[PDB]
Design an enzyme around this catalytic site. Structure first.
Site, mmCIF file in Angstrom:
data_model
loop_
_atom_site.group_PDB
_atom_site.id
_atom_site.type_symbol
_atom_site.label_atom_id
_atom_site.label_comp_id
_atom_site.label_asym_id
_atom_site.label_seq_id
_atom_site.Cartn_x
_atom_site.Cartn_y
_atom_site.Cartn_z
ATOM 1 N N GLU A 128 0.787 -1.151 -0.178
ATOM 2 C CA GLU A 128 0.043 0.056 -0.179
ATOM 3 C C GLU A 128 0.711 1.319 0.039
ATOM 4 O O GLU A 128 1.038 1.708 1.042
ATOM 5 C CB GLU A 128 -0.924 0.024 0.941
ATOM 6 C CG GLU A 128 -1.903 -1.117 1.301
ATOM 7 C CD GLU A 128 -2.794 -1.011 2.315
ATOM 8 O OE1 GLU A 128 -2.859 0.077 2.845
ATOM 9 O OE2 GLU A 128 -3.480 -2.221 2.802
ATOM 10 N N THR A 197 -12.261 -0.768 -1.650
ATOM 11 C CA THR A 197 -13.270 0.204 -1.601
ATOM 12 C C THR A 197 -13.699 0.697 -0.375
ATOM 13 O O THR A 197 -15.063 0.467 -0.013
ATOM 14 C CB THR A 197 -14.469 -0.312 -2.722
ATOM 15 O OG1 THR A 197 -14.688 -1.732 -2.397
ATOM 16 C CG2 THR A 197 -14.083 -0.156 -4.168
HETATM 17 O O1 LIG Z 1 -6.232 5.288 3.744
HETATM 18 C C1 LIG Z 1 -5.698 5.796 4.809
HETATM 19 C C2 LIG Z 1 -5.216 7.168 4.741
HETATM 20 C C3 LIG Z 1 -4.991 7.837 3.656
HETATM 21 C C4 LIG Z 1 -4.317 9.142 3.583
HETATM 22 C C5 LIG Z 1 -3.700 9.507 4.798
HETATM 23 C C6 LIG Z 1 -3.977 8.730 5.874
HETATM 24 C C7 LIG Z 1 -3.134 9.183 6.969
HETATM 25 C C8 LIG Z 1 -3.117 8.510 8.217
HETATM 26 C C9 LIG Z 1 -3.762 7.176 8.319
HETATM 27 C C10 LIG Z 1 -4.374 6.869 7.205
HETATM 28 C C11 LIG Z 1 -4.314 7.554 5.815
HETATM 29 C C12 LIG Z 1 -5.113 5.450 7.051
HETATM 30 O O2 LIG Z 1 -5.208 4.693 8.324
HETATM 31 N N1 LIG Z 1 -5.852 4.790 5.994
HETATM 32 C C13 LIG Z 1 -6.176 3.566 6.112
HETATM 33 C C14 LIG Z 1 -5.552 2.415 5.609
HETATM 34 C C15 LIG Z 1 -5.798 1.103 6.381
HETATM 35 N N2 LIG Z 1 -7.070 0.984 6.582
HETATM 36 C C16 LIG Z 1 -7.350 -0.379 6.396
HETATM 37 C C17 LIG Z 1 -8.616 -1.273 7.165
HETATM 38 O O3 LIG Z 1 -8.225 -1.135 8.515
HETATM 39 C C18 LIG Z 1 -7.432 0.026 8.928
HETATM 40 C C19 LIG Z 1 -7.669 1.190 8.082
#
Ligand SMILES: O=C1c2cccc3cccc(c23)C(=O)N1CCCN1CCOCC1
Ligand SMILES: *[C@@H]1O[C@H](CO)[C@@H](O)[C@H](O)[C@H]1NC(C)=O
Length: 377
Positions: A128, A197
């Protein structure tokens, strides 16, 4: 049964949900084999030697979590191992791997030996993200895209002759899709593409938003932060519908609002929501934490009558957006109407598997299964 159906239901298992108090504790034996066709074990990580390695040896090895999840192959479920995840994607180590043909070649042979050693049916790539490391597209080189596609090819070349699966969890974000993914190559070689999504909105936006909008909403900042655009974009870039499984969140994104007498969408937010008792992560609440707040703590629920997105709920300066049974059935009907490969859930341990909220065990996952098995669209 889902195994006899034309759809996949890919369920993510997380090894860290074991480290939760009381009823939040989730173990491999809590997996319901009637609710998934594919289980993906999250996560293995990329070691400092450039080789796939167990992230938590105490659970994965000493307590045999790998084995106890691979156990579900006995039901006909395909059990894959996921590599990466959000936390493991923080630095450059995946970029250093994919940009180094010699490193990829060593990685691929070891990874396949790793899978066969523990009996996994396949590998799931969860970097990611290529180029946009943790959604920061200024961080990684453009060559991440070709390197990732070359890694997928070299993995496929070794896994497919052995009858092993290769899949990837991929970004829903148009800019990340453009920068990181050679879609025609991935679409041809991957057995499925799990489009994540969800997390379209969260505390990082500094205003309230829904974790996983299905359709465009007139107040949206953008036209493309919704599942409908994302799925159609992946297909426009060259992905066959049958390779797409659409991710659905079993959790909510929570917010601490400024509390200037308002509680709707796009209102200013000072911080993530207060962490839940079981998941203990600011900005995040499991579905079983959310429904307890609604059922027993008097949180107010706002639903979208047009069903473009799931509900949100609030109390005081706390605000959370999430998917309920109703919007989930709408999303699965969306899956069936586009003849997608199926659905994906993040994650098994976040649904109300204990029936703490009184709607039955696994209300979200059972709603998905029921709608997938319903022939009407
Ligand atoms: O997309 C982002 C994100 C996007 C852009 C900036 C960020 C800054 C801090 C934290 C996050 C972001 C962030 O935590 N996430 C979620 C990715 C994990 N998700 C998957 C399922 O469970 C846990 C949440
Ligand atoms: C879904 O997306 C397609 C293409 O992006 C668009 O034409 C269609 O209007 C969208 N559907 C809804 C209900 O918004």
């Amino acid at each position: 049964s889902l195994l006899n159906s034309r759809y996949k239901l890919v369920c993510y298992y997380t090894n860290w949900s074991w480290y939760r108090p009381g009823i939040g504790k989730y173990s491999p034996e809590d997996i319901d084999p009637s609710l998934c066709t594919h289980i993906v074990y999250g996560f293995a990580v990329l070691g400092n030697d450039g080789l796939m390695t167990a992230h938590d040896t105490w659970s994965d090895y000493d307590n045999r979590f790998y084995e106890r999840v691979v156990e579900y192959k006995r039901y006909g479920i395909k059990v894959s191992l996921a590599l990466g995840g959000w936390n493991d994607s923080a630095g450059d180590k995946y970029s250093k791997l994919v940009n180094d043909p010699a490193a990829r070649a060593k990685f691929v042979q070891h990874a396949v030996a790793f899978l066969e050693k523990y009996g996994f049916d396949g590998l799931d790539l969860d970097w990611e993200y290529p180029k946009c490391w943790q959604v920061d597209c200024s961080k990684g080189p453009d060559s991440d895209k070709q390197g990732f596609a070359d890694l997928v090819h070299e993995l496929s070349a070794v896994l497919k002759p052995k009858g092993l699966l290769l899949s990837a969890a991929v970004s829903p974000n148009k800019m990340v899709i453009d920068a990181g993914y050679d879609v025609p190559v991935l679409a041809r070689l991957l057995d499925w593409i799990a489009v994540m999504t969800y997390d379209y909105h969260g505390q990082w936006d500094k205003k309230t938003g829904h974790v996983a909008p299905l359709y465009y909403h007139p107040d949206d900042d953008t036209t493309y932060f919704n599942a409908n655009y994302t799925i159609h974009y992946w297909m426009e870039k060259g992905t066959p519908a049958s390779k797409i499984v659409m991710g659905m969140p079993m959790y909510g994104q929570s917010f601490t609002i400024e509390n200037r007498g308002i509680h709707g969408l796009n209102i200013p937010v000072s911080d993530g929501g207060e962490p839940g008792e079981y998941t203990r992560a600011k900005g995040f609440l499991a579905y079983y934490e959310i429904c307890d707040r609604i059922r027993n703590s008097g949180w107010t629920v706002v639903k979208d009558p047009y069903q473009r997105m799931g509900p949100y709920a609030y109390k005081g300066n706390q605000w959370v957006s999430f998917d309920d049974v109703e919007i989930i059935k709408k999303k699965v009907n969306f899956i069936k109407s586009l003849n997608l490969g199926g659905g994906m859930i993040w994650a098994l341990d976040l649904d109300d598997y204990r029936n703490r909220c009184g709607q039955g065990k696994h209300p979200l996952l059972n709603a998905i299964k029921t709608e997938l098995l319903n022939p009407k669209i």
